[PDB]
A paper describes a structure:
Mechanistic and structural studies of three closely related, unstudied OTUs with distinct cleavage profiles revealed four mechanisms for achieving linkage specificity, namely (1) the use of additional Ub-binding domains (UBDs), (2) specific recognition of a ubiquitinated sequence, (3) the use of a conserved S1’ Ub-binding site on the OTU domain itself, and (4) the use of an S2 site enabling DUBs to bind longer chains in a linkage-specific manner. We selected three members of the OTUD family for additional investigation: the unstudied Lys63-specific OTUD1, the cdc48/p97 interactor OTUD2 that cleaves atypical linkages (Lys11, Lys27, Lys29, and Lys33), and OTUD3, another unstudied DUB with activity against Lys6- and Lys11-linked diUb.
The catalytic domains are structurally similar to each other and to OTUD5 (Huang et al., 2012) and S. cerevisiae Otu1 (yOtu1) (Messick et al., 2008), root-mean-square deviations (rmsds) being from 0.6–1.0 Å. Catalytic triads are in competent conformations, as observed for pOTUD5 in complex with a Ub suicide probe (Huang et al., 2012). UBDs do not always influence linkage specificity, at least for diUb substrates, as shown for OTUD3, where the removal of the UBA domain did not change its ability to cleave Lys6- and Lys11-linked diUb. Importantly, the amino acid sequence in the loops varies significantly between OTUD family members, in particular in the His and V loops, indicating changes that may account for the observed differences in linkage specificity.
Residue numbers in the entry:
A (entry chain A), B (entry chain A): 50 to 190
């Protein structure tokens, strides 16, 4: 259908704008931290707490791991600062914090990862982009 | 990917909500009227003005018509109250009013019909749904 010409335009139509985080493997936790706390300075803590939750809830998270890769290897790699995180990390963070994460993408359907079974919870917004990069999505005014 | 369970939830995540218009063929002009003016009472006028614009700009709109259907037949049918309108009517209305129309759809990419070549213009929001039905999309707070 009739597409937006830029991601900035798409967000702007929704009264939203990007808050970019650096192009390294810590981007998801920086973006989620920015959403949760208004800044990304606790990204190492969020990475560690997210891995801790995944381990505590191993039976829930082993299904996410790409086959023939041991769960231990997956979470050990994720524990290292700079390791790019994926959807399973978003699920873990969302469940740990009992909230939802809405994911924006240029000319793609808006996604929602729900951390609870509840009906009215806190909702965080991030943007998925090239490679494995995530940014924070904030209100304009 | 991870989809919203309802259209209401999807809009709510964006701070938006549906304002339903009746399930008849006047829905697009009622929805556009609601967006433009805050109410749908001028839907007959918007239909007539939209057809007038399409006729004035025939060379621009003939390409939209499904082949072997005469342009005259298309616009004559569209002029009748109750005739369901399509994308070409949105383009015509947007160009006539020199604005943009953003179209929401459940678990589909957000669309944008741009009425001008400009960079900063007024933006109207509607929702496309089952059949040929459109509703108005408004801010929650």
């Amino acid at each position: 259908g009739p597409e937006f010409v830029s991601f900035a335009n798409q967000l702007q139509a929704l009264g939203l704008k990007l808050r970019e985080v650096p192009g390294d493997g810590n981007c998801l936790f920086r973006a989620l931290g920015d959403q949760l706390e208004g800044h990304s300075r606790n990204h190492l803590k969020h990475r560690q707490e997210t891995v801790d939750y995944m381990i505590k809830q191993r039976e829930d998270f082993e299904p996410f791991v790409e086959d023939d890769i041991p769960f231990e290897k997956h979470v050990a790699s994720l524990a290292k600062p700079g390791t790019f995180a994926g959807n399973d990390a978003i699920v873990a963070f969302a469940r740990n914090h009992q909230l939802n994460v809405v994911i924006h993408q240029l000319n793609a359907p808006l996604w929602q990862i729900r951390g609870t079974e509840k009906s009215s919870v806190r909702e965080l917004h991030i943007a998925y982009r090239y490679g494995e990069h995530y940014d924070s999505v904030r209100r304009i005014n």
